[PDB]
Amino acid sequence: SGRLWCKAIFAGYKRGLRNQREHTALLKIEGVYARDETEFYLGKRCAYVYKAKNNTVTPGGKPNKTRVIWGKVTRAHGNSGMVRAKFRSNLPAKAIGHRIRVMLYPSRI
Amino acid sequence: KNLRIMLKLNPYAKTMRRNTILRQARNHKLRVERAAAALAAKSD
Amino acid sequence: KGKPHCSRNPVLVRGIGRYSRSAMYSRKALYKRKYAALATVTKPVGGGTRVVKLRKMPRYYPTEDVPRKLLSHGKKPFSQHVRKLRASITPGTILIILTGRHRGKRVVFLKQLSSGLLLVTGPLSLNRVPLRRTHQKFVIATSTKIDISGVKIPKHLTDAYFKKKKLRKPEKEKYEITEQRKVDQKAVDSQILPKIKAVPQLQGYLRSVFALTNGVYPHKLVF
Amino acid sequence: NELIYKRGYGKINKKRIALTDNTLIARSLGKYNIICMEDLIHEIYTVGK
Amino acid sequence: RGLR
Amino acid sequence: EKAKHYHKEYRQMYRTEIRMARMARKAGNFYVPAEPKLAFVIRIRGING
Amino acid sequence: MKASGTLREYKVVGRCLPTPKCRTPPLYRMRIFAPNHVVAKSRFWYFVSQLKKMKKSSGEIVYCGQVFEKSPLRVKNFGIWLRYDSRSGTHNMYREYRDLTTAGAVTQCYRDMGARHRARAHSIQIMKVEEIAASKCRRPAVKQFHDSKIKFPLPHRVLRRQHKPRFTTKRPNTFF
Amino acid sequence: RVKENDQKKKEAKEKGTWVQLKRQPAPPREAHFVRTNGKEPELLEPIPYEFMA
RNA sequence: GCCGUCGCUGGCAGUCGGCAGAGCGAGAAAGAGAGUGGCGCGGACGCUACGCCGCGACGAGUAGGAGGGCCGCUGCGGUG
RNA sequence: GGGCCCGGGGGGCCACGCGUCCCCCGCGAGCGCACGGGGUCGGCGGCGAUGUCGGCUACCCACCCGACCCGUCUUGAAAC
RNA sequence: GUUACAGCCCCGCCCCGGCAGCAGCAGCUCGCCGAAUCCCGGGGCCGAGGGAGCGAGACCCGUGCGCCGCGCUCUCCCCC
Ligand SMILES: [Mg+2]
Ligand SMILES: [Mg+2]
Ligand SMILES: [Mg+2]
Ligand SMILES: [Mg+2]
Ligand SMILES: [Mg+2]
Ligand SMILES: [Mg+2]
Ligand SMILES: [Mg+2]
Ligand SMILES: [Mg+2]
The answer to whether A27 touches A85, Cβ cutoff 8 Å, is yes
Q: What angle do CA A37, A43, A48 make, to 5 degrees?
A: 100
User: From CA B33, how far away is CA B23, in angstroms rounded?
Assistant: 16
Give CA A21 to chain center in angstroms. 16
DSSP letters for C57-72: PPS---S--PPPPPP-
Q: How many CB atoms lie within 10 A of CB F6?
A: 18
Q: How many CB atoms lie within 10 A of CB G124?
A: 19
User: From CA G48, how far away is CA G25, in angstroms rounded?
Assistant: 14
- The C-alpha of C15 sits at a distance from chain A's nearest C-alpha, in angstroms, of 28
Span from the CA of A18 to the centroid of ligand 8 (angstroms): 27
Complete edge-to-edge strand list for the sheet that includes strand G89-99: G89-99, G76-86, G124-132
Strand partners, G34: G8
Chain B: which residues have CB within 8 Å of chain C? 3-4, 14-15, 17-18, 21-22
Q: Which of G119, G71, G70, G73 minimizes the C-alpha distance to G95?
A: G119
Q: Exposed, middle or buried by CB within 10 Å (0-12, 13-18, 19+), for C74? A: exposed
Q: How far is the CA of A41 from the C1' of J67 (A)?
A: 37
Indicate the DSSP class of residue G153.
Answer: -
For chain B, how big is the Rg over CA atoms in Å? 17
User: From CA C122, how far away is CA C109, in angstroms rounded?
Assistant: 9
Q: How far is the CA of C181 from the C1' of I24 (A)?
A: 67
Phi first, then psi: what are they for G15, rounded to 5°?
A: -160, 165
User: From CA G174, how far away is CA G155, in angstroms rounded?
Assistant: 8
Count the helix, strand and coil residues of chain H and give each as a percent rounded to the nearest 5: 25, 10, 65
The answer to whether G60 touches H29, Cβ cutoff 8 Å, is yes
DSSP letters for A18-87: S-EEEEEEEEEETT--SGGGGGGGTT-EEEEEEEEEEEE--TTS--EEEEEEEEEEEEEETTTTEEEEEE
Give CA G151 to chain center in angstroms. 28
User: From CA H46, how far away is CA A5, in angstroms rounded?
Assistant: 68
On whether any CB of chain G is under 8 Å from the CB of H40, the answer is yes
Span from the CA of G33 to the centroid of ligand 7 (angstroms): 61
* Nearest residue: Cα versus C1' of I57: D15
Q: What is the resolution of this structure in A?
A: 2.7
The answer to whether A46 touches A29, Cβ cutoff 8 Å, is no
User: From CA C100, how far away is CA C117, in angstroms rounded?
Assistant: 15
Q: Which nucleotides of J are covered by protein (CB under 7 A)?
A: 1-3, 5, 12-18, 26-29, 34-47, 51-54, 62-67
The strand ranges marked E within G17-175 are: 27-34, 59-67, 76-86, 89-99, 124-132
- Identify the experimental approach: cryo-EM
C1 touches strand K (CB under 7 A): yes
Give the per-residue SS3 of C87-129: CCCCCCEEEEECCCCCCCCEEEEEEECCCCCEEEECCHHHHCC
The answer to whether C121 touches C108, Cβ cutoff 8 Å, is yes
- The C-alpha of F39 sits at a distance from chain D's nearest C-alpha, in angstroms, of 10
Helix (H, G, I), strand (E, B) or coil at D45: helix
Indicate the DSSP class of residue G68.
Answer: P
Amino acid at G69: E
On whether any CB of chain C is under 8 Å from the CB of E1, the answer is no
User: From CA C24, how far away is CA D30, in angstroms rounded?
Assistant: 33
User: From CA H41, how far away is CA C118, in angstroms rounded?
Assistant: 76
Sequence-ordered list of residues with C-beta below 8 angstroms from that of A90, at least 6 positions apart, any chain: A22, A23
Q: At what angle do helices B12-43 and F2-26 cross, to 10 degrees?
A: 50
C3 touches strand K (CB under 7 A): yes
Say if A and C touch: at least 3 Cβ pairs within 8 Å.
yes
User: From CA H47, how far away is CA G89, in angstroms rounded?
Assistant: 16
Helix (H, G, I), strand (E, B) or coil at C139: strand
Sequence-ordered list of residues with C-beta below 8 angstroms from that of D10, at least 6 positions apart, any chain: D16, D17, D18, D19, D24, D25, D28
User: From CA C166, how far away is CA C157, in angstroms rounded?
Assistant: 19
F16 touches strand J (CB under 7 A): yes
Amino acid at F43: R
Q: Which of A74, A71, A25, A24 minimizes the C-alpha distance to A49?
A: A71
User: From CA C95, how far away is CA C121, in angstroms rounded?
Assistant: 10
The answer to whether C160 touches C119, Cβ cutoff 8 Å, is no
Q: How many CB atoms lie within 10 A of CB C12?
A: 15
Q: Which of A63, D32, B25 minimizes the C-alpha distance to C18?
A: B25
Buried b (16+ CB within 10 A) or exposed e, G6-34: ebbbbebbbbbeeeeeeeebebbbbbbbb
